Ligand binder design. Structure first.
Ligand code: NA
Ligand code: NA
Lengths: 310, 310, 310, 310, 310
C-alpha cells in the first residue's frame, strides 16, 4: 500500500442554505505522498501547473483522483498544481470550491449547534494500494469570526474512517473498502436576529391581546381580539421562510401555537361569559378574574419548556 | 449479442421539486461485461482513470455510452473509471448526478405514496449487439432514513424492459428495439408538517367562525364573519405554493372549499334570518338552532370523504 | 445539391414558461443523407460514437451542422452518433435538449389554444448544396397525454420552408436562401385549475358583495362593502403572477374589472341614496329596488362577452 | 492597417430586465476582410466549420478575436463559420447570444423611450493594424413588432467610434486606441399594462376615499378613511417590483405620494373639524365645503405635472 | 526573484448583492514582466491570442497563473492575450469577470460607506521567485458616476501585501509567503430611495397614530390605533428584504422599534385611563395632556440618536 499525507486549508465558509440543506466551502487541497525518485533540472523541485499536468500523466505519472462524497454537483476546481521532487515525493495542489450538503437537526432552532462535515475519498484506489496517513487542518482565516448568521467555536475535529463499499463485490471481491477523510467544523447560531425581530413584536401582540381583557364593552372585546387572532394566525409561515417543510416544531412554532391556544381560549371564555349572561345584564366576575393568575400560568408553561428542553 | 451486467449504487436522493416534477439522484454507475482477453502489466488488472480512457478508446477499445432517458439537462458526471482485466472482462465506472423527472399523481396529497424511477438505455447499441444481463441494486446509505419531507419504504424494485423505437426504421429496418433498465424507489410522504401547520389553524378559524353563531348582536354576527370569510378565501393559494397549477383538488383544497361553503351558507342564513324579521323585532329560533346538528353534519361530510376516499 | 432526410423524435415537452415565453423540448435528431460509397470492416455499418466523430471529420468526412433558430442559449446536446454505411449513406444521430421560445397570443387565456414550433436550419449550407428532402415525425411518448397544464391534440403539423437571408449578400451574392424545417405541435390548455381556484372564490365574493344590499343599517352597508371592495382590488395582480406584463386583458381581467364596476357603482348608489335622504329619515325605495334586475344585467353582460368573444 | 467590413444580423431581442439593467440579444456576426490570395480546391470558396477553424489557425491563418464590451458574463457563441476565398478575402461567421447591459434613465417610466446599444471591439488589434471600414445592419425579423412590453421604432442607428485605452501605455506607448463599433436600437415602452392595471384601481380607491366626505357619521368618516389610507400606503412598493431601488420618483410614485397627501390632509381636516366642535353639537360648514373645489385642485396639480413634465 | 508589473483596468461594477455579500467586477488584467530575450519575426512584437498560448507554453514558455482570492466560483475569463517582445519582456493580457465577496458592516445602513476589495495572488510562485513590483490602477469609465444604488468617491486605494501561508510548511519549509495585490474601491450609498420610499409613509403613519389622541370616543381611540399598531408591526421585515438576517439593528430598525414603543405605550395609557374611570363618566385630563410634550420627547430621542450615532 501507498501512504498519503493530506493537508487541508479552508478559505471561507458561506452560503449556508438550510432550505436546501447546503453550504459552500472555499479552500485548497494539498496531497503529499512518496514514490520512486527521479531526475529534475537543477536540485530544485519542478513546478508543473495546469494544462501541463496532463502531459506528465500521459508520460506515465501516477496521480490518483481524490473526490468528495458529500457534494452536490461537482467541486468547482480552479487551478491545479503538481509539485515534483527528485528524491521521490509527489505533491498535488488544487483549489476546490464545493457546495456541501449534510444532515441537520433543527429541534432547538434559535439556539442550535451544528457542524460542517467534509468527506473525501479516492475514486478507485482502496487502502491496500492507497492509504491516507494523516491530516493536519489549517483554519486561520475563519478561526474566530462570525459567519453571517453562525458563530464558529474552536478548532476542527478530524478523523479518518475506513468504510466498506459492497457494490464492488462483483468486480473486486475481497478488497473493496475505502479510506475516507472526515473533517468536522463546529458551528453555533447567533440567536440575536430572531430575538430582536420576531419574539419581540409577537410579545407586544400577545401583551395587547391580553390587555383587551381590561375593556368594558362587548364589541371592543370581540372585534379587536378577532383581528389580533387572525394576524397571529398569519404568522404561522415564518418557520417555512427560513427552514424547509420540517416535520417537527421549534421555539417559534411552539410559542406561536401557545399564543393560538391563549387567544382561542380567551375568545371561547368571552363567548361562554356572554352565554352565562342570561338576561344580558347579569354580570360575571369570576370568568374575567384571570387577569393576574393565568399570565403567571403562561409564563409557567414557558419556563417549564425552557427548563425541561434546555 | 453481448451480455452486460450493471450494478447500481445510490448515494442520496434530494431536491424533490413537485413544482417542476423533478428530483436529484446521486450515485455511481458500474457496468461489467466480457470481451476478448488481453495482456496487462503483472497479473493485476489495469487502472485507467479519466483523461486516459479516451486514449484507450482511440487505441480501439469498445466502450459503449449508456445514457439515461428520463433526465432533464445532462447527467453531471464526475470522475470516470475504466477497469481492464487480462482475462477479458471490461468494467466501466463513473459517478453520475442527474436531475430526474417523471410523472406524479397528487390525488391524496397529504398522505401520498410515490416512486422514483431511473430509466437507462444504451445510446446506439440494440440488444442484438448489447444485452443487459441483470442488475443488483445497492441502496444502503438511504435504506431506512427520512428525506426532508419523504419517507423511504423497503428495497428497490427493478425490471429490465425491451422497448421499440420506431424512428430508426428508415436507418435500421428490423433491429431497432433497445434494452432498458428500469429501477423503482418507493417513497411515502410524511403528513406531519401540514398536520401541525395548516389543518390546525384552519381548524381554529372554522371553530371561531362557528362560535360567531352564539352572539346576540347583528353587527358582531356580520362583520367578524365577513372578515373571517375573506381571510379564509385568502388561503386558497396554499396548494399552488408547494404544488403546481394542478387540474384536480386535494384534501386541503376539498377542506377549504367545504369551509367556503360553511361560511357562505352561514352568511346567507343570517341575511335570510334578518329578512324574515319583518318588523325588526320579531325573533326567529329555528334558523339559528343549527348549533349542534350541522357540526355533526360537517364532521359527517368529512368522515364520508375520509372513509370513501381512503 | 445534396438531399437530406431528417427524422425527428420528441421525448417530452415540459417547462412551459409563459412569463419568459419559453418551453423545453427533449428528443433526438436523426439526419440521413447519401454520399459516395466507402469501405467498412465486414458488411455491417460502422458505429462511431462521441469523441471519435471528430477524428473522422479530421479524416475528411463532410458532416454539416444543423442548428435550431428559435432557441434561447444553446441546445444542450448529449451524446452524438455517426452511422457510416459502405454503400454511401451517412447517418448522424444526436440527443438535443433545447429551451425553445416563440410568440404567443393570450386573448382568451383560460381557454387558449397554442402551438409549439421547432425551427431548424443548416448553419452555412444553402439548398443549392444541401437540400432537405422530407421529414417524418415521431411523437408517441407524448401522443395523447396531459402536460402539467396543457393538453395535446392530434399529430404534428410539419412544413419545410425556404427563407432568404439578405445578410449574406456581401459574402454570397445570389445563393443565400436556406432550407428550413418547421414542425408544429398543437396544444390546448386545461381551464380546470382556474375554474376551481379563482373564478369560484371571486364568485362567492361577488355574491356576498351583492347580498350586502339586503341589510338595513348604514354602517353595515358601507364598511363591509368597503372592505370587500379593497380586497377585490387586491386581486388585480393574479394575471401578472402567471403571465407577463401583457398590454391586453383576459377573462379574469375583464371579469375583475366588471366586479370593480359593480362594487364602485354600488357604493356610489348608496352614497347618492343617503344624499337623497334630506332629513335622514325619508326612505328611498327605487334606489335599492335593483336587487333582481341588475343581477340579470350583470349575467347579461357576462353572456354577451361569452357569446361574442367565443 | 487592415480594413474590416462587418455585417450584423439581429435575430430577436428578449429578456429585458430593468431590475438588473440587462437584456438579451440573439443574432449572427459576420466579419469580412481582405488578405493575401491563396489556393482552394476548385474555383469555389472553402467551407471550414467548427472544430476545424482551429486547425487552420494552427496552420498560420490570422483570425482576430472581436469581443463585445458591454456584456455580462461571456457571449454564448454557438457554431462558428470560416469562409475562405482563393482571391484573398476571409470571412468569419459566428452565432452570438449575449446578455447586454447598459445605462437606463427612468424619469418618465410609464411613457419612457430607451435604446439598446451594442459595443464591439477587437481584443488586441488597434486601428493601425485592424480598421473597421463600415457596417450595414440587418433588422428584419424584429423590424416592426412588439417585444413583450416594448415597441420598436425605425431602423438601427449605427456609428463607429475610436476610443483611447490608457492602460496599454506601459505596454504599447503611442498606438493604444481601438476601433469600436456602436449600434443603437431605439425602443419605446407600451403604457397599456400599467394604464389598465394600476392607475385604474388606484383611481377608484382615490374616488372612494373622496366619496367618504359625503357621509354624516363620525365613525364612518374615520374608520373607512383609515383603512383606505393604510391600503394606499401598502401600494408603495409597486415601483420596486418592476424597477430597482431607484433614487428618483416616477408617475406612479408621484401619483401615489399625491394620494398620500390627499388622504392625510383629509384626515387632518376631519380631526381639526371635530376639534372645532367645542360642544360636540356645533356643526361646521366651511371645512367640508371643499367637495367640488379641491377635486379641481387635485386635477389641476395632475395637469400641471402632465403639461410641465411632458 | 522575478519582478512583475501589473496594470489593472476596471470596466464596470454592478450586481452588488448585500443578501449574499457579493458584487460583480468587469475589467481586464495586464501583467508585465521581464525575462530572457528571444527572436521574433520582424522587429515588431508577436501577437499570440487564445488557443495558441497553450502551444507556446508547451514550447517551454513560463506563464504563471495569477488567481484571485476573494472570489466565489471561478473568474469567468474571456479571451486571453500574450504579448511577446524580442528584447525579453513578456506581457499577458486577459479579460476577467469575477463575482467578488467580502465583509461588510451595516451599522448605519441608510448612510453607509463601503469599499470594494480585489485580492490577487499567484497560485504557486512565492516572492522569492515571483515578486510584484508595482500596480497602477485605471478607473475612468466608472471614475465619477452612480452605480444603481451606490455613489463612487475618489480614486482607487492600492497596496501590495505579503502574507504567510502556513499550510505549505510540510511541502515548502521556509519560503511559503505570497505577494498579494490588494485594491480598494471606496463606495458610498445614496440615501435617497429609502428617504422617499419608507421613512416618509412611516412618518405619516406615526403622525396619524398620534392624531388619534384628539378623538373623543372610546371605540375610535382603540380600533384605529389597534389596526395602525398591527400594520406598523407588519413592516418589521423591510430590513430582511434588502439585507440578510443581521444580528444588529439599523436606523429603519431603531425607528420602527421606537414606533412600536410609542404605539404600545399609547394603547397602555388609554387602557390605564379607562381603568382610572371608576364610574365610566369621570374624565381624566392629565393622562391625555401629553399631546405637545411627548412629540418633543420623541423628536428628542430621534435627535439624540442622530447626534450621538453620527
Ligand atoms: Na365597527
Ligand atoms: Na375593521
Amino acid at each position: 500500500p501507498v501512504d498519503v499525507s493530506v493537508s487541508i486549508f479552508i478559505n471561507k465558509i458561506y452560503g449556508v442554505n438550510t432550505l436546501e440543506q447546503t453550504y459552500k466551502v472555499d479552500g485548497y487541497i494539498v496531497a503529499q505522498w512518496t514514490g520512486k525518485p527521479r531526475k529534475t533540472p537543477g536540485d530544485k523541485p519542478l513546478i508543473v501547473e495546469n494544462t501541463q499536468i496532463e502531459r506528465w500523466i500521459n508520460n506515465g505519472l501516477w496521480v490518483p483522483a481524490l473526490e468528495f462524497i458529500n457534494v452536490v454537483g461537482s467541486p468547482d476546481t480552479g487551478n491545479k498544481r503538481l509539485m515534483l521532487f527528485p528524491d521521490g515525493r509527489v505533491i498535488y495542489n488544487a483549489r476546490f470550491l464545493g457546495s456541501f450538503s449534510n444532515d441537520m437537526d433543527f429541534r432547538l432552532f434559535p439556539f442550535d449547534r451544528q457542524q460542517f462535515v467534509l468527506e473525501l475519498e479516492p475514486f478507485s484506489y482502496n487502502n491496500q494500494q492507497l492509504r491516507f496517513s494523516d491530516i493536519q487542518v489549517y483554519t486561520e482565516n475563519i478561526d474566530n469570526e462570525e459567519i453571517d448568521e453562525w458563530w464558529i467555536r474552536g478548532k476542527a475535529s478530524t478523523h479518518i474512517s475506513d468504510i466498506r463499499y459492497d457494490h464492488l463485490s462483483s468486480v473486486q471481491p475481497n478488497q473493496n473498502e475505502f479510506s475516507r477523510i472526515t473533517v468536522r467544523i463546529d458551528a453555533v447560531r447567533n440567536p440575536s436576529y430572531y430575538l430582536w425581530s420576531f419574539i419581540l413584536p409577537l410579545g407586544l401582540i400577545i401583551a395587547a391581546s391580553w390587555s383587551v381583557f381590561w375593556l368594558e364593552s362587548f364589541s371592543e372585546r370581540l372585534q379587536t381580539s378577532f383581528t389580533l387572532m387572525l394576524t397571529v394566525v398569519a404568522y404561522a409561515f415564518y418557520t417555512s421562510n427560513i427552514l424547509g417543510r420540517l416535520p417537527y416544531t421549534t421555539y417559534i412554532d411552539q410559542m406561536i401555537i401557545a399564543g393560538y391556544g391563549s387567544i382561542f381560549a380567551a375568545i371561547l371564555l368571552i363567548i361562554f361569559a356572554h352565554h352565562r349572561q342570561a338576561n344580558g345584564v347579569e354580570d360575571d366576575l369570576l370568568i374575567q378574574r384571570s387577569r393576574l393568575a393565568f399570565p403567571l400560568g403562561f409564563l409557567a408553561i414557558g419556563c417549564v419548556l425552557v427548563i425541561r428542553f434546555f
